[PDB]
Design a protein around this motif. Structure first.
Motif, short mmCIF file in Angstrom:
data_model
loop_
_atom_site.label_atom_id
_atom_site.label_comp_id
_atom_site.label_asym_id
_atom_site.label_seq_id
_atom_site.Cartn_x
_atom_site.Cartn_y
_atom_site.Cartn_z
N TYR A 61 -13.67 -3.87 -46.33
CA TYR A 61 -13.55 -4.92 -45.34
C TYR A 61 -13.54 -4.34 -43.94
CZ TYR A 61 -12.24 -9.34 -43.27
OH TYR A 61 -12.23 -10.50 -42.53
N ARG A 62 -14.29 -4.98 -43.05
CA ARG A 62 -14.31 -4.66 -41.63
C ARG A 62 -13.66 -5.81 -40.89
NH1 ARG A 62 -17.99 -0.82 -43.16
NH2 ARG A 62 -18.74 -2.17 -44.85
N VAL A 63 -12.54 -5.54 -40.22
CA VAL A 63 -11.76 -6.60 -39.60
C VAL A 63 -12.44 -7.07 -38.32
CG1 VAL A 63 -10.23 -4.99 -38.44
CG2 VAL A 63 -9.50 -7.29 -38.81
N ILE A 64 -12.76 -8.36 -38.27
CA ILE A 64 -13.57 -8.96 -37.21
C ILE A 64 -12.65 -9.71 -36.26
CG2 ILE A 64 -15.58 -10.40 -36.75
CD1 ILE A 64 -16.32 -8.08 -38.34
N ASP A 65 -13.07 -9.82 -35.01
CA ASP A 65 -12.33 -10.56 -33.99
C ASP A 65 -12.98 -11.93 -33.83
OD1 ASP A 65 -10.75 -11.44 -31.98
OD2 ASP A 65 -11.33 -9.92 -30.52
N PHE A 66 -12.33 -12.95 -34.36
CA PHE A 66 -12.78 -14.32 -34.18
C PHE A 66 -12.01 -15.06 -33.10
CE2 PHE A 66 -13.62 -13.41 -38.70
CZ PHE A 66 -14.98 -13.54 -38.68
N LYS A 67 -10.83 -14.57 -32.73
CA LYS A 67 -10.05 -15.24 -31.69
C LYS A 67 -10.67 -15.02 -30.31
CE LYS A 67 -5.68 -15.10 -34.15
NZ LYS A 67 -4.28 -14.62 -34.10
N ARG A 86 -20.88 -10.32 -45.03
CA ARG A 86 -21.42 -11.51 -44.39
C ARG A 86 -22.90 -11.32 -44.15
NH1 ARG A 86 -17.55 -12.39 -41.59
NH2 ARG A 86 -16.43 -10.50 -42.19
N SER A 87 -23.59 -12.43 -43.90
CA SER A 87 -25.03 -12.39 -43.70
C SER A 87 -25.42 -11.87 -42.32
CB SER A 87 -25.62 -13.78 -43.92
OG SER A 87 -25.02 -14.71 -43.06
N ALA A 88 -24.61 -12.11 -41.30
CA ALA A 88 -24.91 -11.63 -39.97
C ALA A 88 -24.50 -10.17 -39.81
CB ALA A 88 -24.21 -12.47 -38.91
N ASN A 89 -25.07 -9.51 -38.81
CA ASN A 89 -24.64 -8.18 -38.44
C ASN A 89 -23.40 -8.28 -37.57
OD1 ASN A 89 -27.05 -7.07 -39.67
ND2 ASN A 89 -28.12 -7.76 -37.84
N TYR A 95 -13.60 -1.73 -25.07
CA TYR A 95 -13.25 -2.25 -23.76
C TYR A 95 -12.92 -1.11 -22.81
CZ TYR A 95 -13.00 -6.74 -26.08
OH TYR A 95 -13.30 -7.87 -26.78
N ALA A 96 -12.68 -1.46 -21.55
CA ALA A 96 -12.23 -0.48 -20.57
C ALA A 96 -10.83 0.03 -20.88
CB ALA A 96 -12.27 -1.08 -19.17
N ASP A 97 -10.09 -0.64 -21.76
CA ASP A 97 -8.77 -0.18 -22.15
C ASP A 97 -8.85 1.12 -22.93
OD1 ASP A 97 -7.50 -2.27 -21.01
OD2 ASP A 97 -7.49 -3.49 -22.83
N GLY A 98 -9.87 1.24 -23.78
CA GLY A 98 -9.88 2.19 -24.87
C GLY A 98 -9.82 1.53 -26.23
N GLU A 99 -9.49 0.25 -26.30
CA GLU A 99 -9.42 -0.47 -27.56
C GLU A 99 -10.82 -0.84 -28.03
OE1 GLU A 99 -6.88 -3.84 -27.37
OE2 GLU A 99 -7.11 -4.36 -29.48
N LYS A 100 -10.99 -0.90 -29.35
CA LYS A 100 -12.27 -1.22 -29.97
C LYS A 100 -12.07 -2.36 -30.95
CE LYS A 100 -13.90 3.52 -29.87
NZ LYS A 100 -14.14 4.74 -30.68
N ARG A 101 -13.09 -3.20 -31.10
CA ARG A 101 -13.05 -4.24 -32.11
C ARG A 101 -14.45 -4.74 -32.40
NH1 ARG A 101 -8.94 -8.37 -29.18
NH2 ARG A 101 -7.52 -6.70 -29.85
N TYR A 102 -14.61 -5.35 -33.57
CA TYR A 102 -15.88 -5.87 -34.02
C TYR A 102 -16.00 -7.35 -33.67
CZ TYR A 102 -17.03 -1.82 -36.95
OH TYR A 102 -17.35 -0.57 -37.40
N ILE A 103 -17.21 -7.78 -33.34
CA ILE A 103 -17.52 -9.20 -33.17
C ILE A 103 -18.84 -9.48 -33.86
CG2 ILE A 103 -16.35 -9.20 -30.94
CD1 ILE A 103 -19.39 -9.88 -29.93
N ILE A 104 -19.12 -10.77 -34.07
CA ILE A 104 -20.40 -11.17 -34.63
C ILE A 104 -21.50 -10.90 -33.61
CG2 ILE A 104 -21.63 -13.02 -35.75
CD1 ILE A 104 -19.18 -14.35 -36.45
N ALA A 105 -22.61 -10.35 -34.08
CA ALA A 105 -23.73 -10.07 -33.19
C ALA A 105 -24.52 -11.34 -32.94
CB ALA A 105 -24.63 -8.99 -33.80
#
Ligand SMILES: [Mg+2]
Ligand SMILES: [Mg+2]
Ligand SMILES: [Mg+2]
Ligand SMILES: [Mg+2]
Ligand SMILES: [Mg+2]
Ligand SMILES: [Mg+2]
Ligand SMILES: [Mg+2]
Ligand SMILES: [Mg+2]
Ligand SMILES: [Mg+2]
Ligand SMILES: [Mg+2]
Ligand SMILES: [Mg+2]
Ligand SMILES: [Mg+2]
Ligand SMILES: [Mg+2]
Ligand SMILES: [Mg+2]
Ligand SMILES: [Mg+2]
Ligand SMILES: [Mg+2]
Ligand SMILES: [Mg+2]
Ligand SMILES: [Mg+2]
Ligand SMILES: [Mg+2]
Ligand SMILES: [Mg+2]
Ligand SMILES: [Mg+2]
Ligand SMILES: [Mg+2]
Ligand SMILES: [Mg+2]
Ligand SMILES: [Mg+2]
Ligand SMILES: [Mg+2]
Ligand SMILES: [Mg+2]
Ligand SMILES: [Mg+2]
Ligand SMILES: [Mg+2]
Ligand SMILES: [Mg+2]
Ligand SMILES: [Mg+2]
Ligand SMILES: [Mg+2]
Ligand SMILES: [Mg+2]
Ligand SMILES: [Mg+2]
Ligand SMILES: [Mg+2]
Ligand SMILES: [Mg+2]
Lengths: 273, 131, 94, 86, 65
Positions: A61-67, A86-89, A95-105
Motif C-alpha cells: 500500500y502507498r498512502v495517498i493524500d486525499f485531504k 488503483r487505475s490512475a498513476n 514541499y518546501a518543508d521537506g515533507e513528502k506525500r503522494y497525490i493522484i496524478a
RNA sequence: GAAGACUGGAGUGCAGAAGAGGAGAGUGGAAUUCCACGUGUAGCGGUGAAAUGCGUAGAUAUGUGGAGGAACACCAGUGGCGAAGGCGACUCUCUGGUCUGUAACUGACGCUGAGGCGCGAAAGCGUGGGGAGCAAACAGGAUUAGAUACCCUGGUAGUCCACGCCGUAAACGAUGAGUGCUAAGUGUUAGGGGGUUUCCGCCCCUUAGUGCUGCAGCUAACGCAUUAAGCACUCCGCCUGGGGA
C-alpha cells in the motif's frame, strides 16, 4: 500509448497493453509504504461473502493524500509512479518543508511543476480549493462530501466532474455518471481530469492475465443444479424458464432497482442519470 | 515555353495575311534574317528593315498585295519540326507547287532556296514551303 | 513589435474604491509578462445595447499594448473570463 | 520567416557585397524556410494545404542545386558542407 | 449614389465610432445593402467588420425591438 | 559537344494590396426541443378532403427561468480565395499562395512528365464520445382495382466531434499543361500613370482576373470567338460499330 503485440502465439494474438511512457521512476518512496494482505472476499468470520476474488500478485500500500490540507506551502512535483492499488498513476510531491506525500496524478501534470492548495491558489491543473472558490464551468476531480474528510467522489483514471451552479450553502456538480448533485460549498476539490485516460482500451488477451490480477472464474447459473441456483436444472441446454432472470439468491436481476426508497439524501439529488 | 522561334516567323506572316495587315515586326535572329531576306528576292514580301535594340534587335516586314488586294503569299508551312527533323539528299529536294512555289533549305553552303540547291548538288534541312 | 487594443466592461453595481482595484490589477498582470502598457483610458458609464448579463449598463475601459511574445494577452484572456467583475472583453490587433 | 531574420542569411552567404539572387543566397534562404515549416507541419499534422507549399520549396530548392552542380562543382560542394545537406 | 468614405478621405473605419456606424444600419439593426447607401465595394467589406465587432461589445444591437 | 558573352524566359531583393486559403484555442445572438412554475379553457395538429396522433392526469396559447446540441439572418454580389474537392458568426496563435509597382541582383537556372508519392464531395467501415432538429430501415393513418410508393403522424442507424480506413461522382466549362500571334463594344474585382479641379468628381492609358455581345477564322449543326472549339510549336493521357460488359 497503447501497444499491440504481434500474434506470435495464440495467447498473444489479441493482447494489448500500455507502454508506461508517463512513468518516470520504478522505485517507490520507502517511508510511505504500508503492507497489504489479500482477503479473497473472506469475511470477518472467514466465510466467502463476495465471490470471484483471491490469488493474484502481491502488492504493497502507498498512502495517498486525499485531504490536501497543507495550505500555503508550494509543493513541487518530483516523480510520476505506478500504483497497483488503483487505475490512475500517482505523483510524488515534496514541499518546501521537506515533507513528502503522494497525490493522484491529474491529466497534464508533469515533473517540475509547482502545486498549491488553500484559498489563494490559482485555477490550474493540480491545485486544491474549496468548491465555493471554484468558478462555474471548470472541470474538477477528487470531490469530497464532508469538510475535512478527504476526496471520495471522482478518482479513477480518466474521470471528471464539472461545476454547474450555486445555491447559497450548496454547489451543483454534474458527476461523472451523469448525475446532478448538491454538495456543500466548504468541501474541497482538485482542478483537472484524472491521469490515465487510455486505461479502458486495454485488451487482456489471456485468462492467466485475469488470474494475475486476482480474479477467479465465473460459473454461469444455467450450468448448475436446482439446489444451487434458481436457473439450474433441465435436460440439455435450457432457457430461462422463469418470469425474470434471477440472482443466485432470488431477487430479480434485470431492470430491478435496488436503491433504498426512504433514503435521506434524495433531497440533495437534483436529477438522476 | 518557346520551342520553335522559326515557326513563329512562319505563323506571324500567315496571321497578318488573313487580316490584310500592311506590316508586322517581331524579335530578330540570325537565321530569320536569311529567311526574311530570301522572301524579298522572289517578291513575296515588299520590303524588310532591321531595328537595332538592346536585347536582340527587331525586324519589321512589309507585306505585299497585288492591285485590288490579292494576297501574294497564299500559304506557309513548317516541315522540319523540333519533334521530327527532316533531311533531304541532293536528288530528294522537292518542287513546291510544281515549281510555282519555293522551299527554303539550310545547306552546308548557306540558307538558300530549292532551285539554287539543285544547281549545286547539295542537300540539307528543309525549313519551309512558301507558295 | 506587435500592438494590441483591449476593451473590457465592468459591472455597473461597483464602487469607486473597488472599481480601481481591478483596473490596477488587470493593468498589473499585463506588466510582469512581456508587455509594456501605453494608455489606460476609461470611457465611463454607458447603456448596453442588450441585456448581456443580469446587468444593463457598464463601465468601459481601453488599454493599448506593445507586446512581443503575445502571451500577456493570453494571461489577460484567461483571468478575464474567470473574474466576476468583467462581463465582456475583446482583444484587437492592428 | 520574419524580414530581418531573412536579411541576416542573405548577408551571410553573398558571393559579393551587393547581390541578392545568387544560387548560394537563394538556397540558404530556402533551407531556412523548410526548416521552419517542418515544425509547423509536425504539430499541425492535418494541415494539408500548407504542406503543399512545403513540397514546392523542396522541389524548387532541388532545381537550383542541380544547376549549381553542373555550372561549378567546387562551389556546389562548398554549400552542402556549410548548410549540412546531402 | 456617392461613396461616403472615399469622398471624405476616410481610410480606416473604427468599431468604437458608434455615431458613424448608426447611419449604415436600418431601424432593426440590419446592415443596409450597398445599392442603397452607395458605398463602394472596398469599404463595404471594412464597414461590416466594424459593425460585427461592435455588436459583440454591445455598442450596437443585434436585433432591435 | 566544348569554351566564353547577354537579358525579353525563370527566380531573388525593395515598396504596397486584396482575399469565406488552411490548422489550433476560445467566445456570441437569434431560433427549435425538453424541463420547472404562474395565468386559462376545450380543443390542438394535419390534408385536395380526411384519419392516425396530442389534450380535462389540463393540452394548444402565454410570461419567467434552466439544460443541451447543430447551423451561422441582413452584409451577399455570372463578387472573392484555392491545384481540384471545396471554403460564409466573432477574436487570437501558427502557416501557404497570388497580384501591382521598381530594375538593385543571378544569368536559361526552363516546359511537359510514363512509373512513384500525396490530396480528394457524399454515402459507408472500426474504436471512444455526443445527440437539439432532420431522417434510410420500421410502425400506424389515408389514396388506389392493388400501393412493399408519392401524402400525414411517429421514428432507429446516420448526420456532429477525435483518431484510423475507404478512394468513388453528371469529381462538368461534359473542353490536359506550357508558349506566341490574330477587329472591336460594354459591365465588374485588385492595383499603377496622366490631365481638369483646392478636394471630390470626370476622362484617357495600362497590368492581372471575372461576365455579356460580336468580325475574320473554324464547325455536320448547335455554336466558339484575346478567358477560342481560330493560326502555330513541345510533352503527356485516351479512341477505332452496338450488345455481351
Ligand atoms: Mg463477478
Ligand atoms: Mg461465464
Ligand atoms: Mg450439470
Ligand atoms: Mg430453487
Ligand atoms: Mg431452469
Ligand atoms: Mg442443463
Ligand atoms: Mg432440448
Ligand atoms: Mg522579372
Ligand atoms: Mg482565414
Ligand atoms: Mg480556416
Ligand atoms: Mg436562446
Ligand atoms: Mg372527399
Ligand atoms: Mg408552455
Ligand atoms: Mg486559381
Ligand atoms: Mg505565410
Ligand atoms: Mg495569409
Ligand atoms: Mg488573383
Ligand atoms: Mg552581368
Ligand atoms: Mg508539373
Ligand atoms: Mg502515376
Ligand atoms: Mg462522412
Ligand atoms: Mg462512425
Ligand atoms: Mg458510436
Ligand atoms: Mg404503410
Ligand atoms: Mg418527424
Ligand atoms: Mg476522417
Ligand atoms: Mg464503379
Ligand atoms: Mg470515374
Ligand atoms: Mg462540383
Ligand atoms: Mg469525364
Ligand atoms: Mg492550349
Ligand atoms: Mg492560349
Ligand atoms: Mg479581361
Ligand atoms: Mg463486334
Ligand atoms: Mg466489340
Amino acid at each position: 500509448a497503447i501497444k499491440k503485440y504481434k500474434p506470435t502465439t495464440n495467447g498473444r494474438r489479441h493482447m494489448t497493453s500500455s507502454d508506461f511512457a508517463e512513468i518516470t521512476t520504478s522505485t517507490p518512496e520507502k517511508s510511505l509504504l504500508r503492507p497489504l494482505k489479500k482477503k479473497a472476499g473472506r469475511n470477518n468470520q472467514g466465510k466467502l461473502t463476495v465471490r470471484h476474488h483471491g490469488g493474484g500478485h502481491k502488492r504493497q500500500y502507498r498512502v495517498i493524500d486525499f485531504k490536501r490540507n497543507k495550505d500555503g506551502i508550494p509543493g513541487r512535483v518530483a516523480t510520476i509512479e505506478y500504483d497497483p492499488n488503483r487505475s490512475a498513476n500517482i505523483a510524488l510531491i515534496n514541499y518546501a518543508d521537506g515533507e513528502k506525500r503522494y497525490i493522484i496524478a491529474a491529466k497534464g501534470l508533469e515533473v517540475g511543476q509547482t502545486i498549491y492548495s488553500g484559498a489563494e491558489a490559482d485555477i490550474k491543473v493540480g491545485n486544491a480549493l474549496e468548491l465555493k472558490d471554484i468558478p462555474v464551468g471548470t472541470v474538477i476531480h477528487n470531490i469530497e462530501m464532508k469538510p475535512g474528510k478527504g476526496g471520495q467522489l471522482v478518482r479513477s483514471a480518466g474521470t471528471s466532474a464539472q461545476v454547474l451552479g450555486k445555491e447559497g450553502k450548496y454547489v451543483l456538480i454534474r458527476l461523472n455518471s451523469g448525475e446532478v448533485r448538491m454538495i456543500l460549498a466548504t468541501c474541497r476539490a482538485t482542478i483537472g481530469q484524472v491521469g490515465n485516460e487510455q486505461h479502458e482500451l486495454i485488451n487482456i488477451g489471456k485468462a492467466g492475465r485475469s488470474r494475475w490480477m486476482g480474479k477467479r472464474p465465473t460459473v454461469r447459473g444455467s450450468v448448475m443444479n436446482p439446489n444451487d441456483h434458481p436457473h439450474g436444472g433441465g435436460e440439455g441446454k435450457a432457457p430461462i424458464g422463469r418470469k425474470s432472470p434471477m440472482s443466485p439468491w432470488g431477487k430479480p436481476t434485470l431492470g430491478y432497482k435496488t436503491r433504498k426508497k426512504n433514503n435521506n439524501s434524495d433531497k440533495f439529488i437534483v436529477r438522476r442519470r | 515555353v518557346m520551342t520553335d522561334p522559326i515557326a513563329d516567323f512562319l505563323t506571324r506572316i500567315r496571321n497578318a495575311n488573313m487580316v490584310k495587315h500592311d506590316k508586322l515586326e517581331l524579335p530578330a535572329s540570325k537565321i530569320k534574317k536569311e529567311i526574311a531576306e530570301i522572301l524579298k528576292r522572289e517578291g513575296f514580301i515588299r520590303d524588310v528593315e532591321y531595328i537595332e535594340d538592346d536585347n536582340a534587335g527587331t525586324i519589321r516586314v512589309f507585306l505585299k498585295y497585288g492591285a485590288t488586294g490579292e494576297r501574294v503569299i497564299t500559304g506557309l508551312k513548317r516541315i522540319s519540326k523540333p519533334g521530327l527533323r527532316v533531311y533531304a539528299k541532293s536528288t530528294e529536294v522537292p518542287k513546291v507547287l510544281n515549281g510555282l512555289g519555293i522551299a527554303i533549305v539550310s545547306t552546308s553552303q548557306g540558307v538558300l532556296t530549292d532551285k539554287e540547291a539543285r544547281a549545286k548538288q547539295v542537300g540539307g534541312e528543309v525549313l519551309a514551303y512558301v507558295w | 513589435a506587435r500592438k494590441y487594443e483591449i476593451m473590457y466592461i465592468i459591472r455597473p453595481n461597483i464602487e469607486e474604491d473597488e472599481k480601481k482595484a481591478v483596473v490596477e490589477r488587470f493593468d498589473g498582470i499585463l506588466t510582469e509578462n512581456g508587455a509594456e502598457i501605453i494608455e489606460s483610458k476609461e470611457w465611463g458609464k454607458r447603456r448596453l445595447a442588450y441585456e448581456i448579463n443580469d446587468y444593463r449598463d457598464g463601465f468601459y475601459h481601453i488599454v493599448k499594448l506593445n507586446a512581443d511574445k503575445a502571451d500577456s494577452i493570453n494571461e489577460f484572456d484567461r483571468l478575464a473570463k474567470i473574474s466576476d467583475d468583467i462581463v465582456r472583453h475583446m482583444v484587437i490587433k492592428e | 520567416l520574419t524580414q530581418e531574420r531573412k536579411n541576416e542569411i542573405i548577408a551571410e552567404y553573398r558571393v559579393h557585397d551587393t547581390d541578392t539572387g545568387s544560387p548560394e543566397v537563394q538556397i540558404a534562404v530556402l533551407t531556412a524556410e523548410i526548416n521552419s515549416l517542418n515544425e509547423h507541419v509536425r504539430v499541425h499534422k492535418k494541415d494539408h494545404h500548407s504542406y503543399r507549399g512545403l513540397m514546392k520549396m523542396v522541389g524548387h530548392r532541388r532545381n537550383l542545386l542541380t544547376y549549381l552542380r553542373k555550372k561549378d562543382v567546387q562551389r556546389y560542394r562548398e554549400l552542402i558542407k556549410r548548410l549540412g545537406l546531402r | 449614389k456617392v461613396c461616403y468614405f472615399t469622398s471624405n478621405g476616410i481610410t480606416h473605419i473604427d468599431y468604437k465610432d458608434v455615431e458613424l456606424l448608426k447611419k449604415f444600419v436600418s431601424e432593426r439593426g440590419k446592415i443596409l445593402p450597398r445599392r442603397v447607401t452607395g458605398t463602394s465595394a472596398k469599404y463595404q467589406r471594412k464597414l461590416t467588420v466594424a459593425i460585427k465587432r461592435s455588436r459583440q461589445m454591445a455598442l450596437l444591437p443585434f436585433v432591435a425591438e
